């Protein structure tokens, strides 16, 4: 699940999602 800020898109929570 992609975050709105693509700066947060890396893997801070997207990987876990």
């Amino acid at each position, epitope marked *: *699940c*992609e*975050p*709105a*800020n*693509p*700066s*947060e*898109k890396n893997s801070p929570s997207t990987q876990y999602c």
Partner: antibody
Amino acid sequence: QAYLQQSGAELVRPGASVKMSCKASGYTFTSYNMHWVKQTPRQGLEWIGAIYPGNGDTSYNQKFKGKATLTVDKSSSTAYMQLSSLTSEDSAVYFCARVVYYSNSYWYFDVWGTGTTVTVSA
Amino acid sequence: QIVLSQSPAILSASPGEKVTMTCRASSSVSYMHWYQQKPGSSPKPWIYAPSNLASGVPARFSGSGSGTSYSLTISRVEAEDAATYYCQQWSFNPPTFGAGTKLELKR
């Protein structure tokens, strides 16, 4: 002094193509990420997408698929949006916006572009 | 997509009156955001995090709420407050905006 200047207004023809500028100044470009909002009398304000100029990483609203790509330039400190296959559905004001994921505890539109008004007709 | 709905559509407000608009969400949201937009110009950051005032914004503007129920509130209405106020969420991708509450001043 952190301006987010945008292009004025555009005439586009039905089923054509348009690229609009969004140039930045007063902050490290690559250190903040860039969004693109549509406004129309009806349906109001609609987020379209975003891009992180630290690499060119994106994200796209489903509703604008196959019509809203966000390319980014060399260090002319600028983001871009191309709209394709324009119908009179696309006559709108198009804002670009900058995000600070943190002013207090949330991601947040800090400064905005002036908005590019698009008229679609032949 | 969280659909954000605002009440009222038009808020009639006499100068110096205490009024309040509400932003309701389809699902739970962590924080609420508010803009002031005057016709012809871009939306202006007004409230960031349901409580905090963007720089420049007078402290007659106040804000509240949790879960799906939020409220921007102007303690004494002033002439320059005539604008449309939009709420906005970040929680669910895509970020979505209210349909806006237009503040009309009843001079």
